Amino acid sequence: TVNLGCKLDLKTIALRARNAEYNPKRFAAVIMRIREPRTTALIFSSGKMVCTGAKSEEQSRLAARKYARVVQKLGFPAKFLDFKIQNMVGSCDVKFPIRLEGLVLTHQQFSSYEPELFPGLIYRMIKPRIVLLIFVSGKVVLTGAKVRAEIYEAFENIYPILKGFRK
C-alpha cells in the first residue's frame, strides 16, 4: 500500500485516465492497471492507494511511483508517502508425489486438510507465521509473508518433512 496524502476526484480520474475503470454502484475505489511489471492499483477517495501484482518489492515501489506520476500528470498534488509492503506470495515444486494423510496425522495441531472442499492441504506455520498450500503433485504455495527470508525460512523448515513423505 501507499498513501498519496491528499483527497482526489475519482470520477475525473476515470474520465482522464486511459487504463482505468470506475463504478460507484460496484465499488468505491478506482481501478488502474499498467503494463510496467504488469500490475493493478486501488485508489481511494481518502487518499490511500493499494498496489498489487508486482513480482518484486523494487518494481512495486517502482509501479507505485509511476501511479503517483500519472496522478501528478492529471494536475493533482500527488505525494509518495507511507509506502509499505503488506504481503508477499511465493511458490515452488519438489517434483515428487507426497503423503498427505500422514502429514495431517503427524501435524494435527497445524494442518487442516479438507480433501472434500479445497484439494490441497492448508498448513499454518507459526515461525514467520506463514500460510502454506501443499498439493499432492508436490507443488507448494506460500502467503502471509512480509519479507522473502520468511518464505525461504518457512520452506527450509518444511522441505525435509515433505521429502520424508515422498512416494
Place this chain on the structure above:
DNA sequence: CACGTCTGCTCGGCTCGAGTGTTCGATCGCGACTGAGGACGAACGCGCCCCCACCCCCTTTTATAGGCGCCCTTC
C-alpha cells in the same frame, strides 16, 4: 253602647312524602377412600421496531486443482 254576624288567625287533625328496616330470590364457596405394580418421556415461551455497537462482506493479483455449468458438436 251592646249584641249579633262575618271574616281572619290559631290549634288540632289529616295527608303525603321521606326514612328505616323485613322478606326473599339469587349467587357463591367448600368438602368428598384405598392403592394396586409402574413407567420415562414431551417440548417451548407477547412480537416487533428502533437505536446502536461491532464485525462481516465487495475488489484485485497468482499459482494451484478437483468440481461443475454451459454450449457446441455429433450421433
